[PDB]
Amino acid sequence: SIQECTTNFRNFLMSFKYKFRKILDEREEFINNTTDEELYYIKQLNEMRELGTSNLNLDARNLLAYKQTEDLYHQLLNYPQEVISIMDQTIKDCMVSLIVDNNLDYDLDEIETKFYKVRPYNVGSCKGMRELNPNDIDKLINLKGLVLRSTPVIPDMKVAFFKCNVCDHTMAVEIDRGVIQEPARCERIDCNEPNSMSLIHNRCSFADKQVIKLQETPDFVPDGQTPHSISLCVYDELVDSCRAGDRIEVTGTFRSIPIRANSRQRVLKSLYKTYVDVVHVKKVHNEVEEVRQITDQDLAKIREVAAREDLYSLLARSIAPSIYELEDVKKGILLQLFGGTNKTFTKGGRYRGDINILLCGDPSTSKSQILQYVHKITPRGVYTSGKGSSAVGLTAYITRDVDTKQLVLESGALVLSDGGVCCIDEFDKMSDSTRSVLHEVMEQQTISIAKAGIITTLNARSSILASANPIGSRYNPNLPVTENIDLPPPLLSRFDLVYLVLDKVDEKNDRELAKHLTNLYLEDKPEHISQDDVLPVEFLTMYISYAKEHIHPIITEAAKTELVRAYVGMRKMTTRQLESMIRLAEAHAKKNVVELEDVQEAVRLIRSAIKDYATDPKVQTGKSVIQRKLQEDLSREIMNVLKMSFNELIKQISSDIQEALSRLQQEDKVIVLGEGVRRSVR
């Protein structure tokens, strides 16, 4: 009903608080009594008069929170063709009531003449392009896809302009439902001549109309099927707001227009061209004021794991519970998913904050299995090969549309992954023309292509996770790293972590690895492992997306001092290694600050690959003393006291400290006397 939907929407905009949205979202532990009690729609209506806009970003989730608007939200998803027209009239009467209640000296004619439009978005009916049932004609369905191409603005006539050829009588006839009712006779009494009005297209009021081709999201497309596309229609002032390679959320009506079988006849085919009329554009003009993702109950569990000291070991085991060992390798990949923040500068250059990890060593060591697991976690991750993708498939291949037969520009494997991790297999089997393109992606995160007279720079800010392989498929220990792999020296310095996973023959390692792989095939579920030791895939994705949008670590003065000293010591044994330790230390605490414990962990990951070598590439008790010198060093401080606690010995002079104390206890040289303090021999 018209009168029923009017009073329901009027009282909703005058009696709504932020506490109602927190009820349906299961948010009862973070409710403020100063900001949630105030009306949100009142401040939005007051800002429209001050700024002078004419579009309201109405949230569809707010209608479900109110118990009196339960039937109104169901009617909007059914046929919004008659519901939006009611909301455009109820918002006009509410604007006039706010002026009389405030008693302002403003022009009332300039406000009533302005036609206000409502833009609903973020509904509950999130049906994809494959679930478009035929009974959903003219229904607002939210779509979550990706923009493929962009078409220029096409003018759409709205008000026709006519002019006589005898008396020159200008007229203005509006178009109703796409029907241009031309006048048969002139309106002038002195003229009155049939078929004497001329249509002037240069004096007509045109409207903006843009066609955007949206591609289906690969996260929802089932395995074995190709993602289709759909046509979108953007009107009003929302044009020129969606570029190629952007993740938006289209929540508009699902209309349809008939097609003609011939360009000269008036016949129509049985098929109807389906198109989605865009109403609101929510990126994943104006700006998002806030987001209400996940659940507040899950945030308490997130902070519970963050308070535990075993976070670096729990997340390393849950990222790959099917691969044994590789603790140093999994610790680097975990930081690649998080990564450092992006401190954007206005007068400075853009610094790449991603972590480029390169795997090396002998093959058949669970190298290809790692690239298949990160792709399933990242929502924008891809998986490509070496020889299967040259320098054209990774950049942007110049394709053509099968509808307009025009030269279009399609994104590649490096452009579609705007925000994820790119998994490339067989990095050593790439051509020379493909290795030169990755030099600019790992530095400025930009792809400049100048072919066929089109010199454009494409942005590609994503991490590269590849796995190299030797020439003879066997890493010889008597050969340098630059000679075993055919990778360019400049390409090796651009990476951040160059792991070398070797296949060493060990009886103690092959016995434990075979028992771990056999337990996964015996039982489908790890019953021996507790639930608090392995995190599910759904909880791991919510912990990375939440920290990458709110947690921003800042390098303090104490953390920046140790980074300079660590960079000088590494050269005394390029500038790319300095930026790798910054993103590694920032992702470990992602804590609002960078502590000293996070910087020390990043140096251990870098020293794990660049050590045990100096002028040439390719036990410690008697030959390298240490144990012989520590017996006279730690006992020297103890003898000086008698002439102490365990914490005072470290500050006055810690795995080697406890080992030296156990050696003197067997020779009757010291006294334990508990773990608190130590006593010397009498």
Partner: protein, 320 residues
């Protein structure tokens, strides 16, 4: 009934043949898992089990025109059945297919063994190396002459899904043809990124290649890795790597010449100690065994670990 026909399935579409003033078919009603457990088929399977020695009977019934190579024919019997596809709940899909590669001098009837396993398997596609390049092996991105849509035509690794892929002349292949092979033997998928189509097709086939030496005959003075023009990365993915060497012997050549003359005379196999199994009944025994998923025992897990230690120690001492 819309949104229910997958590309690559063999179903019985029932409808009416109505012309269009072009002839269309109005749809009205619409592999190893499609064979029903018929009582008549189950009676034929139990007849071979009660006869005794089923493993040695099916190993000798394959290729009746090839004498010898008892160990080579034993690996071909397990290729038609295969292992189990243990799908881990975390997201890991363990490949249950077996990768067997035949090598040796081109004279041990390599072309006959590849065609014998293709006719037995219901979804087997036989191909060569130089005749099928990277387009025919993976997928051809052709253009539709009606709807003008870029489809994905299935090649050799796509149409032979859940079967055995027969590849001839593995040594004479190009470098661009080994790209999809490295992905099938690891993830059983095909990464296609041509004509703006970035889709992945599943390929759960059984690759059965047949390599040949570069110098024709095998050279015992040279290393096995240098005699065959194949890298060490491809040999690690293959489970069994046979090597049928053509050793001249007066005892083997006398028994082989008598078996050939008997085939070209009576058009049948020589009378042995058992009746030959027809290919119509062999397909019923393989499809029935694929439904049974055996579970590894706990007492046999200690023998597998101890066997891997002795195998790794012998290969380390033979490196020089």
């Amino acid at each position: 009934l819309v949104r229910s026909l997958s590309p690559g399935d063999i179903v019985d579409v029932t409808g009416i043949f109505l012309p269009a003033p072009e002839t269309y078919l109005e749809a009205q009603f619409v592999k190893f898992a499609s064979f029903s457990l018929t009582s008549d088929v189950e009676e034929r399977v139990m007849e071979l089990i009660t006869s005794g020695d089923v493993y040695n009977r099916l190993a000798k019934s394959i290729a009746p025109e090839i004498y010898g190579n008892l160990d080579v024919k034993k690996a071909l019997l397990l290729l038609l059945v295969g292992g189990v596809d243990k799908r881990v709940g975390d997201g890991m899909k363990i490949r249950g297919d077996i990768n067997v590669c035949l090598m040796g001098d081109p004279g041990v009837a390599k072309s006959q063994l590849l065609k014998a396993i293709c006719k037995i398997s219901p979804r087997g596609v036989y191909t060569t190396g130089k005749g099928s390049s990277g387009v025919g092996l993976t997928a051809a991105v052709m253009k539709d002459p009606v709807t003008d849509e870029m489809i994905l035509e299935g090649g050799a690794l796509v149409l032979a899904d859940n079967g055995i892929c027969c590849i001839d002349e593995f040594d004479k292949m190009d470098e661009s043809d080994r790209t999809a092979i490295h992905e099938v033997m690891e993830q059983q998928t095909i990464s296609i990124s041509k004509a703006g189509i970035n889709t992945t097709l599943n390929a759960r086939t059984s690759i059965l290649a047949a390599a040949n030496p570069l110098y024709g005959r095998y050279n015992p003075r040279l290393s096995p890795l240098d005699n065959i023009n194949l890298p060490a990365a491809l040999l690690s993915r293959f489970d069994i790597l046979f090597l049928m060497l053509d050793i001249p012997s007066r005892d083997d050549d006398e028994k082989l010449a008598e078996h050939v003359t008997y085939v070209h005379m009576h058009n049948k196999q020589p009378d042995l100690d058992f009746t030959p199994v027809e290919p119509s009944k062999m397909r019923e025994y393989i499809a029935y065994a694929k439904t049974k998923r055996p579970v590894m025992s706990e007492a046999v897990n200690d023998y597998v670990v101890q066997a891997y230690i002795r195998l790794r120690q012998d290969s380390k001492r033979e490196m020089d």
